[PDB]
Amino acid sequence: PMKLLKRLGKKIRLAAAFK
């Protein structure tokens, strides 16, 4: 589901921006 992919992507991109 797209709405869940937002929640998934948020953690992924946050970790991406982290470093």
Swiss-Prot record:
Coiled coil: none annotated. Belongs to the eukaryotic ribosomal protein eL39 family. This is Large ribosomal subunit protein eL39. It comes from Pyrobaculum aerophilum (strain ATCC 51768 / DSM 7523 / JCM 9630 / CIP 104966 / NBRC 100827 / IM2). The lineage of its organism: Archaea, Thermoproteota, Thermoprotei, Thermoproteales, Thermoproteaceae. The chain holds residues 8 to 18 of 51 of the full protein.
